[PDB]
Structures are given as C-alpha cells and as structure tokens.
C-alpha cells in the first residue's frame, strides 16, 4: 500500500477485530441462561399519585433533588420551576434567558440549579441568594454546539455534554473548562455520572456510548451495538453497569468489566424510539420512556416487558427515580410531570 | 410547622399568579422558526426584520404585527447534523423555509431537506412557509442563459408553465417558467404526503422586500384558521 492512511485503516480494522475477539472470549454465557431460574416480577401497576401542573410548554428535563422531595423541571417556555413533590407546591419559578432549555440539574447540596440548551451556555442559579431574588450566578461558555445534558459533581464542578461532540468538566467558580473529553463523532445526547462521581458515560448519535474518566480527561471505554442514535443513559446503581436507550426501539445493558452488551430489551410491537432510561433503587426494574406516550417497566434481568405507565397523552421526554427509590417522576411534552409509585 | 405550611401556600400563591401572567404572555406570542440551507439569506431576513420592523447574527427577533407578537429565531451556532435539535421545534407556529432558488446545485440539497422536514415524525403538524428567495438573481441567470435548469432537472424541458400563474408586470416568460417550476418542485413534495394536518405556502421573496412581515402574518393566521377548521371537522 505505502499510503499511511491505508496502513492505518488496515491496522484499525485489525485492532477492531482483536477487540471483537477479546470481547467474545469473555462472553461465555448469556444473561438469559443465568437468569432463567428467577421468578418474573409479574405485573407492576403504579398509579399517578401526584400531577404537577403549571408549565406552559413541553417539559424537556427533570431532576430529583438529593432529599428525594424537591425536583427541578425545565420547560421550553423558558422556565425552570422547582417543586416540593410531597405537597405539589412551587418553591421557585426561575425565568430563563434563552427559552430553549434542554437539560436541567439539581446540585447534590441543593444550593444551585443548572440549565442550558441551544444557547450553548450552562447557567448556574443560586437558590440560596440572600437579599433579593434567585438570579443567575455563573454562566459557563465555550461550546460550539447545543448543550444537551449536565449534572453536578459538587458545588464547584459540573459536567456538560454538547452537540459539538464533546463533554466537558467545568469549575463553576472560575468558569474554565478544567477538563475536556473528545472522541465522539456525533452529537452527545445524554450523560450519567457514576454513583461515586469518579466516571461518567455519554451516548452519542454515532450509535456509540463512551465511558470517560472524569479526573484524567481520557476516554476509557467505547461501547457499540446499537443500530442508531442513543438518546438516554443511566448507570446501574452498583456502578459497574449502565443502560442505554436508542431510536432503534431497544434498550441495552452494558457491563464495564465484561466490556460488551449483556441484554436487549425489545418487543416486536415496539417500533418507536426511546427517550429516557432509569433503574430503580435496587436495579431490578428498568423504566424506559418510549415515544408512543407510555413508559414501559422492564425486568432488567429477564428482558421481559412487565408493566406500563400509560398516563401521558404525548411523548415522555424525561423521567427520574428518587434517590431513596420511593417514586418515579415522568415529564412529557404535554407539560405535566407526574409522580408514580 | 403550620407556619411553614402557610409559607409554602403563600409562596405558591405568589408563584401561581406570576405564572398566570407568564402564561398569558407566552400564550399570545407566536413563535416562528427560520430554517433553510445557508447561503440562502435566513440571517439576512432576521437582520432585515430587526432594522425595518424591530427586534431585540443573533438568533432571535421579536416583532409585532397588528398587536400580535411574533418571535422569529434562526439557529446559527450549530453543526450541520440538524437531526436532533430539530425536535426542539415541535410547537412552533410555522417553519419559514428559505431557499436560494438561484443556486442550481445546492438546490437538490434544499429539496431533500424540505422532504425530510415534511416527513419528520415530530414535525408532521408544523406547517411550513416556503420562501423562494433571491428572485432577482434568478432572473439574472435566466436572462443570461448561461446556466439552464434543464442540465440539473431534465424534467424542466417538458415542463409547462401553469395556467394559474400570476407574473408581476414586466417579467420574461422564461423567468416565470423557471420560478414556477421551482415552486412546483417543492409543492409536489409538500402535497405528496397529504393528511391535512399541515400545508406548505410558497412565496417568492427577495432580500429587499419590506412586506415580508405582512406575509408571515397572513400565513400564520391562515395556519391557525386551518387548524381550527380541521379541529371541528369542517375542512
């Protein structure tokens, strides 16, 4: 050949096949053979216990607080409302500058909320301001694409995902990108921090998910297997597994130590994509927010579909389980967060 | 602790009344998305609206026609894979698709993008206002006769100018046939899907046109009229 591009393409494919062999080498059994003797969960019929109204447009992101009581919701009317989920009272109603918010987070200390969207800016708002009104405190600039998701580590570090195919760890005070994560080809759509803040994964429109080491700025693992755009992601509560949902109407569970897909959750009556995924507190139940307006609760061990949450009249855009596992909330484009248990 | 329940209740009261005023303002604002390839004049259209009618390469503009507010925004700072942030625009009143009718080879890109927009699962109900921009340059190319449409779209050779065409005073029939051919090339896709949930409204525009707000007003009004009709099963 001689042309260094063709020699790199050849050694690239050679490496990809060494990776496929080292991955199938440890793929001794399947999850179904191992989990064939467990009893099925049966039927899980949760009911709407609360309905949280007020939003004037489609809800696009939501996030429980650490106390499992408060939650922040971002709607595309330019608002970010904080709810006391027990009493359905609104604690704050923060107007936004750019009305196209796409993500919103709740700092684990409850001191700050964040949000961003097509403005390519992550805005931090201090809920504990003293003299006056909750207003903007910091504002993280730098992305050349739309910001799709963000989650706090602590009151000073926050990670963002953007449509410029990169993720970034920020120091909120200095406003500098203390660490940049590059390598995705398509738009990064969702990220989920491990329960120990140490690593985080991201799913992009190149049908690939990547595991990133937060502190070192290097891409540790790249997982493939999905046929189309990955729309949602969430670590297994243990930290050594994570689930992805994609537009190909399938959910997939990947393991970190085995470095391959473990199980695929699908039904031949399910064709529409997937918008959100999240495990229960014990990880036995996997909730997914399909486009057909329902949320299916799958048994994460048997790949069987178990229950449905048919309470939304339009696409379920986001969801989230409390940190104590007592209830799950679902935000949809009908502008009504709903609490279920 | 009853004090804290009453404080939460009155915080909810002040919030809900702020949210009620916000609901009325947002409810009365007609959001308009400006879309189209680049080198087509989207940002120039927004620039023209801010200077003629008023407003706020900046993404947004806010303007009033007959006491009805509109907010037209063109997204500029993204990549070219518009396949995912486009779903952020499902509730807009209309999409204003602007197409450089004088760029004979990036025109197929505009046709493919319009077709992909028209059949999108999440924009199935978003009506589109079609702006066939740069008509003066199109007339320049047609009168020059150096780059003919037939070399890129051979159908144009057998194409007949529609009998309903209304050319403006002083226009060569070749230019009329060219611009109505591009019009029907986009209308055959917009009408091939059907279902009545949304429609396409073509308009011939140039960069110096000043009435390009009354046209958007008229057509947003037409869109709302037809939505209200198709709701009561009349139309």
């Amino acid at each position, epitope marked *: 050949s001689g042309s260094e591009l063709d020699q790199l393409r050849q050694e690239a494919e050679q490496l990809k096949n060494q990776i496929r062999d080292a991955r199938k080498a440890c793929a001794d059994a399947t999850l179904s053979q191992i989990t064939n003797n467990i009893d099925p969960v049966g039927r899980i019929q949760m009911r709407t216990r609360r309905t949280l109204r007020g939003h004037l447009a489609k809800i696009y992101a939501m996030h429980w607080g650490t106390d499992s009581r408060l939650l922040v919701s971002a709607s595309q009317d330019g608002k970010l409302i904080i709810w006391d989920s027990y009493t359905t009272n609104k604690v704050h109603a923060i107007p936004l500058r750019s009305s196209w918010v796409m993500t919103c987070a709740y700092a684990p200390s409850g001191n700050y909320v964040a949000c961003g969207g097509l403005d390519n800016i992550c805005s931090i708002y201090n809920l504990k301001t003293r003299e006056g009104n909750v207003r903007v405190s910091r504002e993280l600039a730098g992305h050349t694409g739309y910001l799709s998701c963000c989650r706090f580590l602590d009151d000073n570090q926050i990670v963002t995902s953007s449509g410029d195919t990169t993720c970034a760890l920020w120091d909120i005070e200095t406003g500098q990108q203390t660490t940049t994560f590059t390598g995705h080809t398509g738009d990064v759509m969702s990220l989920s921090l491990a329960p120990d803040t140490r690593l985080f994964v991201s799913g992009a*429109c190149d*049908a690939s998910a990547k595991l990133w080491d937060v502190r070192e700025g290097m891409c540790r693992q790249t997982f493939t297997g999905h046929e*189309s755009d990955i729309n949602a992601i969430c670590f297994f509560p243990n930290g050594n597994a994570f689930a992805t949902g994609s537009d190909d109407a399938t959910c997939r569970l990947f393991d970190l130590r085995a470095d391959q897909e473990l199980m695929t959750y699908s039904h031949d009556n399910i064709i529409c994509g997937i918008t959100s995924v999240s495990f229960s507190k014990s990880g036995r139940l996997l909730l997914a927010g399909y486009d057909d307006f329902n949320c299916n609760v799958w048994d994460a061990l048997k790949a069987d579909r178990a229950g449905v949450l048919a309470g939304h009249d339009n696409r379920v855009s986001c969801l989230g389980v409390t940190d104590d596992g007592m209830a799950v909330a679902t935000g949809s484009w009908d502008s009504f967060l709903k609490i279920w248990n | 602790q009853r004090n804290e329940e009453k404080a939460q209740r009155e915080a909810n009261k002040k919030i809900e009344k702020q949210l009620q005023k916000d609901k009325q303002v947002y409810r009365a604002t007609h959001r308009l998305l400006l879309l189209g390839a680049d080198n087509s004049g989207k940002s120039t259209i927004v620039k023209q609206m801010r200077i003629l009618h008023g407003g706020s390469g900046i993404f947004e503009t806010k303007f009033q026609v007959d006491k009805v507010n509109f907010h037209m925004f063109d997204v500029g700072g993204q990549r070219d894979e518009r396949r995912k942030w486009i779903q952020c625009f499902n509730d807009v009143t209309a999409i204003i698709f602007v197409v450089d009718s004088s760029d004979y080879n990036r025109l*197929q890109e505009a046709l*493919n*993008l319009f*077709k992909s927009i028209w*059949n999108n699962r999440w924009l199935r109900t978003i009506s589109v206002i079609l702006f066939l921009n740069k008509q003066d340059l199109l007339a320049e190319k047609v009168l020059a006769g150096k780059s003919k449409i037939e070399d890129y779209f051979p159908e144009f050779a057998r194409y007949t100018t529609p009998e309903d065409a209304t050319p403006e005073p002083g226009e060569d029939p070749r230019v009329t046939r060219a611009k109505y051919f591009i019009r029907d090339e986009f209308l055959r896709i917009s009408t091939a899907s059907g279902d009545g949930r949304h429609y396409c409204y073509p308009h011939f525009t140039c960069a110096v046109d000043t009435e390009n707000a009354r046209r958007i007003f008229n057509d947003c009004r037409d869109i709302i009229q037809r939505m209200h009709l198709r709701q009561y099963e009349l139309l």
Partner: nanobody
Amino acid sequence: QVQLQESGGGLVQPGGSLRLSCAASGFTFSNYKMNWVRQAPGKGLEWVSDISQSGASISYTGSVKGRFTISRDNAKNTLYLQMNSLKPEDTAVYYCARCPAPFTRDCFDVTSTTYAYRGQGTQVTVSS
C-alpha cells in the same frame, strides 16, 4: 458496530459502466431507507439517489436520471448502484449512506463532515 463496506469502482472510460456493491453489517438492512451519496473532488457532499425500505419507491437526482440504477437485495443484505454511460463529471468517491432511523421516510445524511452510518468510498475515476 454499524459498518458499511462498498466495493467495485476503478478507472473507466467515458460512456463505460460499473457496479458498486454496498454490503451492510451491524443492523437489520430491511428497516432503513438507503441512499447513494457521491462526492466529487473539490466540492461538498452531493446526494445521488435513494431507495426505500424494500425497493418500493425509488428516486434519483436529475443529473443521473436515465443513467444509473439502484437495486436493494435484503436476502444478501446489500444494495448495488449499477452505473452506465458515465460522463467525465461523474468522477467522485461514492459513499453508500444509510439514514439513521428505521420505519420512516426522512433522513438528514449528506452532512458536511461526519455522519456515522455511511461507508468510506471507492474513488471512481472517469476520463479520456
């Protein structure tokens, strides 16, 4: 991992013929609408022709109408662009792109730099 391997394509005189075979591996071929996107040297990506999920409805760019054909075989899991009467301007790399979503009629796959579900190209050169 979704990957598309194209084959065929070499030096061919004007008015000749060729057949570019695009084999897909890593998904279900039948569900996705397929396109042929060619890139001529020195210009951006250009879209040539698309065939639906089962060869039901096909469509072509004007310039290649009446010259090229596009066939899809789900059995062998591939599609073929059979080109005849090639002109000196048909010189281009030929990616065989797939749109990113199943069970639909729309796609946005002529992207400027990076789209993840199109192949690498077989530079078809045609000159005298």
